Structure formats: structure tokens, C-alpha cells
């Protein structure tokens, strides 16, 4: 176990086999939801081809989904070797613990929540079931931060294991986690085994 580690990279092209195996994978990908967005997205085929399978032999996946990715995310979860076994929802509140009910915040109904699929792979050991509820209640914070409560839920589920987050930003770096994303501050690696494999694979850089 180590302090926060991160790699500024394009996740489509990083050879993630150098990172070893993780008890938990978490990802918040910019899905192609078939609408104009003020940020760039990954195509369905780019998502399908992410080398998620090498990151894990036994453990859990947390995959945020929205729009048509409710279904595309399920496809990816099964393709990567997981069975969906839970679905967390994050209920978004305002500053006074109320849901914002007005506006036009979904296509048919308004939206008060975000969804995170939970998948399992293999036969994980040393995990604690049933410690947390599958509902998170938290305000929206800063620039689209998913709720930090999720890290505590995952730590109670799988204490002291190594974990990897995909599409993370500097605010997402955490002890026991390796964070991958293209807005991180360079490359900061501390695990000697990961450092050694990184030098072999990228002798230049």
C-alpha cells in the first residue's frame, strides 16, 4: 500500500498491463450519449476496446453510466468479464438537502440522480458485504466531481487493497489508488514493482 499515485495519459493508449492487478476498478468515462456536449467523448468501439480485463482477476468494478450508456455500460461490463451485482445511485441535493425538482434536466422526466453499476469478476476474497447502502446523498461540488463518499464505501468494502481509477482528475487521487487521466500532473509512481515495469515498457517516456 502506498500514498496517492497517478499517470497523466491517454487511457486508450497506455499499456495498463504494467500496473498489476487491482481489487477494485472505478471508471467515469465520457460516454458518447448521442448529444452535443461541451467535452469530448470516447466512441462505443473505443470503450469496448479498453483493456479493463487485464486490470483484475478477482474483484469489483464501479462504472458510472448515464443516458444510452445505461445499456452500453451493461454491455461493456459483461464484455470485460463482470456480472452486474448492484447499482448505486447518487441522489443530488442542493445546499439545503433538497432535490432540485425544476428545470428540464432529463429528456422525459427530470433527473435527481446519477447511476453507478457494480460488477464482480472471479472469486474475490477479503471483502465486506452489506456495510453501506446503495444510495449516496450528496451535493454537487465544483467541476462535476462525483461524490467523494464513494471512496469510503469502497475502502470499507475492500480495506487495504490496491485500486485503480480511470478518467480521474487531480481531486480524485487517494491513498491505495492509482489514478489515470489526461488532466493529471505528470507521472507520480511509488510502488517499486510498478516503477520497474514502467521503465521497461517506456525506456524513453
Amino acid at each position: 500500500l502506498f500514498p496517492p499515485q497517478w499517470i497523466c495519459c491517454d487511457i486508450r493508449y497506455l499499456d495498463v498491463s504494467i500496473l498489476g492487478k487491482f481489487a477494485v476498478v472505478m471508471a467515469d468515462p465520457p460516454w458518447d450519449i448521442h448529444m452535443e456536449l461541451p467535452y469530448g467523448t470516447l466512441t462505443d468501439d473505443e470503450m469496448r476496446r479498453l483493456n479493463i480485463p487485464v486490470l483484475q482477476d478477482d474483484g469489483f468494478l464501479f462504472l458510472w453510466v448515464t443516458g444510452r450508456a445505461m445499456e452500453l455500460g451493461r454491455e461493456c461490463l459483461n464484455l470485460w468479464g463482470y456480472e452486474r451485482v448492484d447499482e448505486i445511485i447518487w441522489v443530488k441535493t442542493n445546499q439545503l438537502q433538497r432535490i432540485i425538482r425544476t428545470g428540464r434536466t432529463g429528456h422525459w422526466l427530470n433527473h435527481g440522480k446519477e447511476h453507478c453499476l457494480v460488477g464482480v469478476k472471479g472469486n474475490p476474497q477479503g471483502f465486506n458485504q452489506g456495510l453501506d447502502c446503495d444510495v449516496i446523498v450528496a451535493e454537487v461540488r465544483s467541476t462535476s466531481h462525483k461524490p467523494d463518499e464513494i471512496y469510503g464505501m469502497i475502502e470499507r468494502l475492500s480495506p487495504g487493497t490496491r485500486k485503480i481509477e480511470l478518467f480521474g482528475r487531480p481531486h480524485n487521487v487517494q491513498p491505495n489508488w492509482i489514478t489515470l487521466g489526461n488532466q493529471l500532473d505528470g507521472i507520480h509512481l511509488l510502488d517499486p514493482d510498478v516503477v520497474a515495469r514502467f521503465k521497461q515498457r517506456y525506456p524513453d517516456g
Binding site: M70, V85, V91, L109, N110, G112, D134
Partner: protein, 284 residues
């Protein structure tokens, strides 16, 4: 750290216990124009509602085509085994597997432009209900979550599904769309964005399988179609504006000719709308 997840670990109060103003009345107590939109739409629904109609039927053996005319909205509440495994109580009716549910010929009674609301539970039904929607010819388009609080009985409850990782404290009602509907052009069929995709109530009494009545309010506010079917309803869910069909109904009054007459000339299958509602409802 105002971490309600940690607070649940420490106290047994579910995070949803701390969401304020979730009741039908208190949500817009301070917002007269928001309250007025709901009040006028509910009056429009009540003024145009058919009297309750209901039919006892063993849906597993029933030719569903005997239900006419076609329906603008269908609410489907099949009795899932998980409702009883997770509570421990013995069911007093046949439980339906997802294979059983899939076999229903819902596409044979849905109107060409219409919506479905399918209670899917909290486990494998979130996946298999989506397959049912495909089979019946709908596209999944929203997910209404019923989130259960435990304000009156704080504590943990063991989820019995051996695959579960977290304590399951909600149920999902998947919404599907059939046909082509454009919310800017088809305002005589839908009023979009009047409700949110969350219902928050206290966990029901020990042996209570009912779903929250607010699901009817969301459906009625959203779709102006007057032909509304509730499959697997019960005596306790009978409601003006709805045809209720289910195995545990104790009596039947459904007459297909009389029911259809409420929607044919000089009547309409749509509620219409008032100028006051048109000026208040959310629009592009």
C-alpha cells in the same frame, strides 16, 4: 465530514433519511406557482378520469388481447419472488419469474405511441426487465427509483441476494417508450419534465408489498393519454382513470364495450389541456 454513508455505518440511518421535503404536499409548500401547476394538472386528470374498472384474471393463462382498446400507458407490477425472499414472508399468489413476465404479449395491447412503467425490483430484474422492454418493442428511456427511508426504525437490514455487495434500499421502475414522440411537437400527448425520477417514502410495514401511490401521479402528469392499464393491481390499487387487471382482485366490473365508449366519439382518448396549464408547464 458530512458523510451520510459514514453516518449510516455509525447509526443505521440511511442517507436518504436526510433528504428534506419529499412528500407530495411539502415539496412545493413554499412555491405557489410550482404547486399551482401540479394542482391544475391533477384537476385536469380528475375531471377527465373514467370511473375505476377492474378485472380478475389469471394473467398467465389469459389471452391479453381481450383487453381493449389499446393503452397509452401500462403499469406492470408482477409479483417477483425477490419481494418475498427479501422480506421472508410466504406469498399468497404465484410468483412470476422473468421468463414468465417475458412471455406476456404486451406489444399486442400497447398503443402505437405509448409508454410502459415496469417495476423491476433491485436485483437481476434491472437487467432482465430491459430484455422484456426490447421483446415488447419499447426503448428504455427513464428509471424511476423508489428510495426507502428508515426514519422510524434506524438499523441495517440484511439483503438476502447472495450476489449483493451493498445493502439494497431502493426499487427501480423502468420506463419505456414505444413509437415516435417529440416533446416540442407532441404536447397534446406528453407534458415532459413535470416530475423527477425519484420517489422517496418510508419502508413499508413488515408484510406490505404495495408500491408507492406517487408512481400513478408521475404517470398521469406525464402522459395525456386517458387509456391506462395496471397489470397485477389489486383491490387496494383500484383508481379512477385506470383499468386494473390482476389475479387477486376479488370482483370484476370490466366491460370492454363500455370501457372503450369512454374514449370514442364525442370523447377523445387524450385529456386535452387548459390555457392556464399551457402557460405554466415547462417548455423549450
Amino acid at each position: 465530514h458530512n458523510d451520510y454513508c459514514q453516518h449510516f455505518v455509525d447509526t443505521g440511518h440511511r442517507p436518504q433519511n436526510f433528504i428534506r421535503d419529499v412528500g407530495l404536499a411539502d415539496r412545493f409548500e413554499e412555491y405557489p406557482k410550482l404547486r399551482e401547476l401540479i394542482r391544475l394538472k391533477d384537476e385536469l386528470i380528475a375531471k377527465s378520469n373514467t370511473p375505476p374498472m377492474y378485472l380478475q384474471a389469471d394473467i398467465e393463462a389469459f389471452d391479453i388481447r381481450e383487453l381493449t382498446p389499446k393503452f397509452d400507458v401500462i403499469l406492470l407490477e408482477p409479483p417477483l419472488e425477490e419481494y418475498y425472499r427479501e422480506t421472508g414472508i410466504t406469498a399468497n399468489e404465484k410468483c412470476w419469474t422473468w421468463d414468465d413476465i417475458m412471455k406476456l404479449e404486451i406489444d399486442e395491447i400497447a398503443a402505437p405511441r405509448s409508454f410502459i412503467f415496469l417495476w423491476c425490483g433491485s436485483g437481476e430484474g434491472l437487467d432482465l426487465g430491459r430484455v422484456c422492454l426490447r421483446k415488447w418493442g419499447y426503448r428504455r428511456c427513464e428509471d424511476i427509483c423508489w428510495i426507502k427511508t428508515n426514519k422510524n426504525n434506524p438499523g441495517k437490514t440484511k439483503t438476502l441476494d447472495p450476489k449483493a455487495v451493498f445493502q439494497r434500499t431502493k426499487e427501480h421502475c423502468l420506463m419505456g417508450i414505444k413509437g415516435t414522440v417529440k416533446r416540442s411537437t407532441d404536447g397534446d400527448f406528453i407534458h415532459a419534465n413535470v416530475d423527477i425520477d425519484l420517489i422517496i417514502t418510508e419502508e413499508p410495514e413488515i408484510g406490505n408489498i404495495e408500491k408507492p401511490v406517487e408512481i400513478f401521479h408521475i404517470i398521469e402528469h406525464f402522459c395525456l393519454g386517458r387509456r391506462r392499464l395496471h397489470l397485477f393491481g389489486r383491490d387496494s390499487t383500484i383508481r379512477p382513470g385506470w383499468l386494473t387487471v390482476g389475479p387477486t382482485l376479488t370482483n370484476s366490473n370490466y366491460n370492454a364495450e363500455t370501457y372503450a365508449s369512454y374514449f370514442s366519439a364525442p370523447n377523445s382518448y387524450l385529456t386535452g389541456c387548459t390555457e392556464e396549464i399551457e402557460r405554466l408547464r415547462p417548455k423549450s
